[PDB]
Symmetry: C2
Subunit: 235 residues, 2 copies
């Protein structure tokens, strides 16, 4: 990895649809604008961007979607949310229960309901890509949901355990899968394709000299939050 | 129809995926950030946003996509580009030739061999939504491409003419279709469904009392640029 340092400090970063967003330890919300992390209105502990929009959650687990000029609350509660899927939203709540919203509901406004679908299982972190979603549970075990589509956000309905341990995991729009483990090591899943969505093995890489805290990938660029909150941008 | 005036001045506006973007007469590029049209770096004569990203074109007809902190030049030439399709790119070039880029290609970077698909026909303006794309030709005749999908961006391959005249047309993520004609009137297509993607008729509406220039719709909100460059934000009954 050839990386550069990007100025700023974050605890979480997400990249998708050409955007790069994140939050810092004070839960200030940032968008990468002309190569500068730029604060926007809001208080969020997790901020995601991708083909499903700009989605975040606050400390109280309220869910927000950026629309028509600002964050608007969506009905429900989640501790983490991802917008990487194919116009679907996915996330987990404080009890590690797993939810997704289908494209037809995501794109309906006004709405007198947000018809979340519960997935069978437990995860502390859940991220979606073009044809699958990956997550980890409270014991850092790794899972894939295959056959996810825009109006079948719940997929095949049966999670598959993928050997290994990760503390968080992100799925990119080109299908790439990266994660960080409890030791702050960084990994990519090799051999991931639409035909083989589970891929083949894990390979380690190093962007942060001091340990990695958070990772996301989009459009040939790997984004890292290091242990100290500093940011790396990698090809 | 209820409308308010929103501060700013543009020649073109697009809304999609909860974002609203546009360009002004100077080709300065704007994003609606915390309810204020905020200038970001870049020179573009058309700026689009939707599930396929933030896409634009400049005076030279070079194509740009916002990626990884700024605008990145793509391979190809377009005079107008739209990002409202299902992770596909669509547009027209200086000869009114029509192009789309499939989802898997749109998401691949670097892209040294970009597999643009040329569609059969001529349009001066082309916009995509969840299951179809709509466009108009240089004589303001209106066309739909049916059966468009993420990795068959060319759809059925055969454009169907829809009666009426429009100068531009935009398709929303919920399938709504709006357009503005050369006289500055504003229309919505009625009867549009997945089963009946071409819909059934046009209905006129008035947001700009002195004439409409450009329209886009996203998530229950209709956005107008009026003839004078002023902006309206409207909510339908
Ligand atoms: C920013 O958000 C984080 C996460 O919600 C806050 O840290 C949590 O604070 C709550 C009490 O509100 C505790 O129950 C949790 O143990 C904390 N979580 C973690 C991971 O530390 C943090 O306080 C917020 N920061 C500010 C400045 O408000
Ligand atoms: C902004 O962009 C527009 C569109 O490219 C420019 O207007 C065109 O100028 C070209 C010269 O390159 C003429 O050939 C066209 O007739 C013009 N088109 C239109 C619609 O006016 C305009 O000059 C640019 N403005 C600035 C300040 O850069
Ligand atoms: C994401 C979210 O808030 N999901 C909720 C779930 O918590 C709740 O139990 C249920 C009640 O019917 O509605 C939704 O599915
Ligand atoms: C993500 C993950 O669990 N990666 C593992 C790593 O922990 C382990 O140390 C290594 C050695 O066998 O194999 C894999 O790369
Ligand atoms: C989009 C479009 O072409 N609308 C036409 C309008 O031009 C015409 O004046 C009206 C009355 O015949 O019929 C349609 O509404
Ligand atoms: Ca993501
Ligand atoms: Ca559009
Ligand atoms: Mg003003
Ligand atoms: Mg799709």
């Amino acid at each position: 990895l050839d990386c550069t340092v990007i100025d700023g400090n974050l605890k979480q970063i997400d990249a998708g649809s050409g955007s790069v967003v994140g939050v810092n330890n004070l839960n200030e919300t940032f968008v990468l604008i002309d190569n500068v992390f730029t604060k926007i209105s809001g208080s969020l502990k997790h901020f995601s961007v991708g083909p499903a929009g700009q989605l975040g959650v606050n400390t109280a687990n309220n869910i927000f979607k950026y629309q028509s000029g600002g964050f608007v609350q969506l009905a429900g509660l989640l501790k983490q949310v991802d917008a990487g899927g194919d116009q679907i939203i996915a996330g987990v709540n404080m009890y590690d229960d797993i939810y997704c919203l289908n494209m037809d509901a995501n794109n309906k406004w006004p709405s007198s309901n947000t018809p979340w679908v519960q997935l069978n299982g437990k995860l502390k972190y859940y991220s979606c890509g073009p044809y699958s979603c990956w997550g980890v549970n409270s014991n850092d075990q790794i899972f894939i949901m295959k056959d996810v589509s825009s109006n079948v956000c719940s997929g095949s309905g049966s999670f598959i355990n993928i050997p290994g341990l990760l503390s968080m995991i992100e799925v990119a729009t080109d299908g790439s899968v990266f994660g960080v483990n409890s030791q702050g090591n960084l990994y990519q899943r090799t051999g991931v394709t639409r035909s083989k969505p589970d891929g083949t093995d894990w390979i380690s890489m190093v962007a942060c000299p001091n340990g990695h805290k958070h990772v996301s990938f989009d459009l040939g660029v790997l984004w890292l939050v290091c242990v100290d909150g500093s940011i790396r941008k990698c090809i």
